[PDB]
Amino acid sequence: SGFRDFLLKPELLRAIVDCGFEHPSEVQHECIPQAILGMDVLCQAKSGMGKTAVFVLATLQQLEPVTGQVSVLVMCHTRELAFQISKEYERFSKYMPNVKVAVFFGGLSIKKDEEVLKKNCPHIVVGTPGRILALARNKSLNLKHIKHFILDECDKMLEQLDMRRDVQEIFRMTPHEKQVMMFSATLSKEIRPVCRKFMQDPMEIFV
């Protein structure tokens, strides 16, 4: 199964080989090619289909790192998944020197997060709506350079009125010209339209 069958940069393909993948799932086969071109995506895929890899690979492939600038924002509902996402970015960026990732899921002292943003500004930020919004509101987190807006476990986030509003306020702070992708193992018929309100003629896949 050609991960090499995708148009990926050499350093990226090499990292994938090192991780021992060799077989994209049907979802990866149908999402990655379009995701790499910056197309918006709404994807419902069961556990094991490799949803994280889809956006991790797609965003690393499009990454045009600028020191002191955050260009990728990923948000999700569970703390465990947030760190697994960061783990994945590290795995696939093994041969891409200086690609920095930071996780802001909710640690006492927002000051610590501000210090990371100020002294070792990351290129990719992964976190929870509340904390991301707080950092954005106090100006520690500059969101004017986001080129990729990604939500994982997107239904759990948007189905809750309070978290939905937070995500909406954050979205409003980012550039219009950007890629938006959302993933979840479960996307009810009722929540799908809500996800699409953040996208532009997105590719859709439900399994």
Next chain:
Amino acid sequence: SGFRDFLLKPELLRAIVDCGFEHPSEVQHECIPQAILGMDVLCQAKSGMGKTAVFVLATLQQLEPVTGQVSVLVMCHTRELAFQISKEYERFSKYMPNVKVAVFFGGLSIKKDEEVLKKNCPHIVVGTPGRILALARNKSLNLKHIKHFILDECDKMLEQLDMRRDVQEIFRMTPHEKQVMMFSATLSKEIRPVCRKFMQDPMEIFV
């Protein structure tokens, strides 16, 4: 838990756990506790035993950061390993935003390496003997503050008479009061004594 019993500072233990590390190798279990106390180390461990993690964690734990000066020097044989060591440092210094690392493995104009030391002096330097010595000789790199002298793939380095001489000249420029640690997948009986000449009653482990 795994690394939770290593008596590492909060910010460091957190990075370890958040990065998904819960399985210290036998080598790491035996070396880390002593390395953290500043003990010199001579270690032979097969690939996958976590040699780099040993000195990355030990040195981050002992690091007493001073703006403008390098306190940790790591040198190895292969260019690829040099860059992965850098990734390891970045990974575990996740919650230590002020700590900076740089890689100088040659290949390009030394002026560029000089540019780094004159504007963004790192606390940790990783590179090849030839280039480190050159930067040291022209004064760009001040080695009078090194508290940790580390060699990975030490046998391949000390094996070559010319590379050995470069290492000896660099060593001579560092403070007497420092920690010296050497690692490799293979330490012949003939090169072990050569490694120990740079150490003071070191802990030795050969597996």
